[PDB]
Design a protein around this ligand. Structure first.
Ligand SMILES: [Mg+2]
Length: 296
C-alpha cells in the first residue's frame, strides 16, 4: 500500500514528499458533503475506491453548511467520517479530514480538529483540511483563522500535513504568495478548479505562487463547471491533469455522489458498498476512475 511505501508525509520546499524525502503525488477522489450523500461514508466504499479506482487518497467532506451539518448534528457527522478514516487506515491509504465550510467557524474548527488530532494524529494516513472553500473574505482573516487552528493542531499533532484554504474557493494563491503563514512546517495551500469554467489564468496564478515558495495541493477538482453541473470539459480536464502531473501536484476529484449533476460520479442505482460496474459510473465517474488508474 501507498502508506506502507511512503509512511509519514512531509513538505520540502514546495514538494509533498515521503519519509525518505522522495516526491509523492497523491491521486484520488472526494466523497461529497456527508450531509447530502451519507450512504457512501462506509468502509466498503473506501476499500472499493482503494482497490478498483486505485485511489491513494480519499477525502471526507464534513459539511458545515446545508441542513444536517456538523454544527446542527455533530454525532451524525462523526458517524459518517469515522468509518472512512478507519477504512483508509485499514486499506493503507491517505485520508483528508475536510472541514467542509464556506463561512468562518473558528471555535468549531479548533474543537473539532483538537479531537481529530488527539484520536488520529499518530497515524501517517491522516491529512487535515481546515477550511474547504472560504468565499468572500480577505486573505488576512483566513490567515488568522488558519494560524489559530494550526496552533491547536500542532500542539497535539506536530508532524501531519495541514491543508490551508484561501478566499474565492481556494483561487487567491497570489494573496497567499504575498503574505504566507510563517514559522510552520508541513502545511500546503489548497487550490480548487473545475475544468469547464476556470481557464488558463488559474494554472498560471498557481505556478506563480509555487515559484514564490507556496506549496500547492489540489484538495478538490473536477471536469464539470464550477457549480458542479453543466458541461463536462474533457479536453480541459486532460490539460489540468497533465499540468498537475508535470508539476507533481497532488489531486482529488469531486464527487463520489449520485445527484443529477455532472460532477456526481455515480448513478443512484449504485450500491453504497461499491462494486460499481461500468453502467453505474456516470461519464465523469468513468473519466475520474480512468484518470486515477492510469496515473497510479
Ligand atoms: Mg502526527
Amino acid at each position: 500500500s501507498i502508506v506502507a511505501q511512503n509512511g509519514r508525509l512531509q513538505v520540502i520546499g514546495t514538494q509533498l514528499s515521503n519519509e525518505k524525502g522522495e516526491p509523492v503525488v497523491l491521486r484520488g477522489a472526494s466523497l461529497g458533503w456527508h450531509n447530502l450523500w451519507p450512504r457512501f461514508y462506509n468502509k466498503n466504499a473506501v476499500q472499493w475506491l482503494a482497490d478498483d479506482w486505485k485511489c491513494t487518497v480519499v477525502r471526507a467532506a464534513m459539511g458545515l453548511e446545508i441542513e444536517d451539518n456538523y454544527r446542527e448534528n455533530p454525532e451524525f457527522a462523526l458517524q459518517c467520517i469515522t468509518p472512512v478514516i478507519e477504512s483508509a487506515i485499514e486499506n493503507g491509504i491517505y485520508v483528508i479530514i475536510d472541514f467542509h465550510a464556506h463561512n468562518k467557524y473558528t471555535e468549531e474548527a479548533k474543537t473539532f480538529f483538537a479531537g481529530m488530532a488527539e484520536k488520529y494524529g499518530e497515524y501517517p494516513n491522516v491529512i487535515y483540511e481546515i477550511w474547504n472553500e472560504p468565499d468572500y473574505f480577505e486573505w488576512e482573516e483566513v490567515k488568522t483563522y488558519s494560524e489559530e487552528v494550526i496552533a491547536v493542531i500542532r500542539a497535539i499533532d506536530p508532524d501531519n500535513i495541514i491543508l490551508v484554504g484561501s478566499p474565492h474557493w481556494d483561487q487567491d494563491l497570489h494573496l497567499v504568495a504575498e503574505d504566507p503563514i510563517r514559522d510552520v512546517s508541513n502545511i500546503m495551500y489548497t487550490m480548487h478548479f473545475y475544468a469547464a469554467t476556470h481557464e488558463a489564468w488559474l494554472r498560471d496564478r498557481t505556478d506563480e505562487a509555487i515559484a514564490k515558495g507556496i506549496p500547492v495541493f489540489v484538495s478538490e477538482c473536477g471536469g464539470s463547471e464550477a457549480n458542479g453541473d453543466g458541461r463536462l470539459g474533457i479536453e480541459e480536464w486532460k490539460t489540468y491533469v497533465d499540468w498537475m502531473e508535470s508539476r507533481k501536484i497532488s489531486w482529488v476529484a469531486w464527487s463520489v455522489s449520485d445527484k443529477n449533476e455532472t460532477c456526481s460520479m455515480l448513478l443512484p442505482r449504485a450500491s453504497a458498498d461499491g462494486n460499481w460496474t461500468e453502467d453505474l459510473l456516470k461519464p465523469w465517474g468513468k473519466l475520474t476512475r480512468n484518470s486515477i488508474r492510469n496515473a497510479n
